[PDB]
Amino acid sequence: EMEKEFEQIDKSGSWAAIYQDIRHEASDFPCRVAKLPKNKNRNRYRDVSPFDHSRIKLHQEDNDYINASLIKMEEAQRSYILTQGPLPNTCGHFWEMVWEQKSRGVVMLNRVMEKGSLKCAQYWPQKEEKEMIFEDTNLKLTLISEDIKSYYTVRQLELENLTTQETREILHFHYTTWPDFGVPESPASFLNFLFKVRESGSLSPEHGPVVVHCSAGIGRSGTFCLADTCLLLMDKRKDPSSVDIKKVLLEMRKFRMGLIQTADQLRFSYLAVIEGAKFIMGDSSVQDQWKELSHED
Ligand SMILES: Cn1nc(-c2ccccc2)cc1NS(=O)(=O)O
Ligand SMILES: [Cl-]
Ligand SMILES: [Cl-]
Ligand SMILES: [Cl-]
Ligand SMILES: [Cl-]
Numbered sequence: 001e002m003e004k005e006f007e008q009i010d011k012s013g014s015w016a017a018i019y020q021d022i023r024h025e026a027s028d029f030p031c032r033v034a035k036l037p038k039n040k041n042r043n044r045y046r047d048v049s050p051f052d053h054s055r056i057k058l059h060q061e062d063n064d065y066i067n068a069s070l071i072k073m074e075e076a077q078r079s080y081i082l083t084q085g086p087l088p089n090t091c092g093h094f095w096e097m098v099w100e101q102k103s104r105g106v107v108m109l110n111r112v113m114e115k116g117s118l119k120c121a122q123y124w125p126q127k128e129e130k131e132m133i134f135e136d137t138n139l140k141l142t143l144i145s146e147d148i149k150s151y152y153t154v155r156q157l158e159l160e161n162l163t164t165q166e167t168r169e170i171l172h173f174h175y176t177t178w179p180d181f182g183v184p185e186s187p188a189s190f191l192n193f194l195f196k197v198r199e200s201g202s203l204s205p206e207h208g209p210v211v212v213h214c215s216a217g218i219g220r221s222g223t224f225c226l227a228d229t230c231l232l233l234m235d236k237r238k239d240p241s242s243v244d245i246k247k248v249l250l251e252m253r254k255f256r257m258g259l260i261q262t263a264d265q266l267r268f269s270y271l272a273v274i275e276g277a278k279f280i281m282g283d284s285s286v287q288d289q290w291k292e293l294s295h296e297d
C-alpha cells in the first residue's frame, strides 16, 4: 500500500535504491528504426529512442519515423503518446502524428529554452495573425485563443488538413515551471494542472491518445503519465490499496525507455497519487484547495 511504503522508504532513506532497482528491472527492447542512419536528424538525443514495437509510425510514404511511443495501458484503459520536443525539421511530422492519431490534446511539460539551450522547437504559433503552414505534411496551424495562468497556459489551436480542408481543434496545456530533472513546485500545483487536462475532455477514449512531451519525452513526461494512470486505476476500482505504483511504472517502461528520470520524480509521483486519491475517493473540495495553493492567477 502506497502511503505506508512511502513512509518506510522515506524513513530508511532509500529512494535512490528503490529507483535504481526500477532502472535495473526495466525492459530493454530494440530501437533499430530510430538508429537507422537516415533517422539521425530526427532524434534530439542519441540515447533516447522509441522501441520499435511501440513507435508511432507516420503515414508517409517516404520515411515513417518519428521519435514517439504509444504507451498503451491495458488495465487502466488509457493510452498516451510520449515524444521528444520536436526539432526544427520534425515539427511537420509532429502535427502529422497528432492528425493521423486523432489526438485532441498535447501536454507540453518543458520550455523552449531551458538552462540556456534550445530544448524544443517553437512548433506552435504564438500569435493569432501568424499561422504556421507545414508544407511537407500539408497542414496549417492557427492559434485561436490562449488562457495564461501564473505557471501554465492553455491554448486553443486549429489544425487543418490542407489536402481535405478538414479542421480540428487541438488543446495545448503548457506547464512552464517544471524544471528539467526536477519536480513540480507542489503536489497541488501538479494536480491542479492534471485535472485541467482531464477537464478538457482530451483524455476521453473517444479521442486518439493525448500527446505528452517534455524535451526528451521521458522524465517529466513519465512523471505525468504515471500519476495519471495510477489515479485512473484507483478510480476504476474505487480502491487506493489496489494500486502498485512501481509496477505501473515498470509496465509503462515496456513502451518507452527511461520514464521518470530521478528518484525525486518517483518520490514526487507517490506524493501526487497519495494526494490525488483524496479527490478520487469522494472529497471534491480538495480540487478548489489545489487551485488556491497553486496560485494560478
Ligand atoms: C533533457 N533530458 N535529457 C534526458 C536524457 C536521458 C538519458 C540520455 C539522454 C537524455 C532526459 C531529459 N529530459 S526530460 O525527459 O525532458 O525531463
Ligand atoms: Cl516556452
Ligand atoms: Cl535559460
Ligand atoms: Cl530545437
Ligand atoms: Cl529547467
Ligand SMILES: [Cl-]
Binding pocket: 023, 257, 258, 259, 260, 261
Ligand atoms: Cl532511466
Ligand SMILES: [Mg+2]
Binding pocket: 127, 128
Ligand atoms: Mg496579438
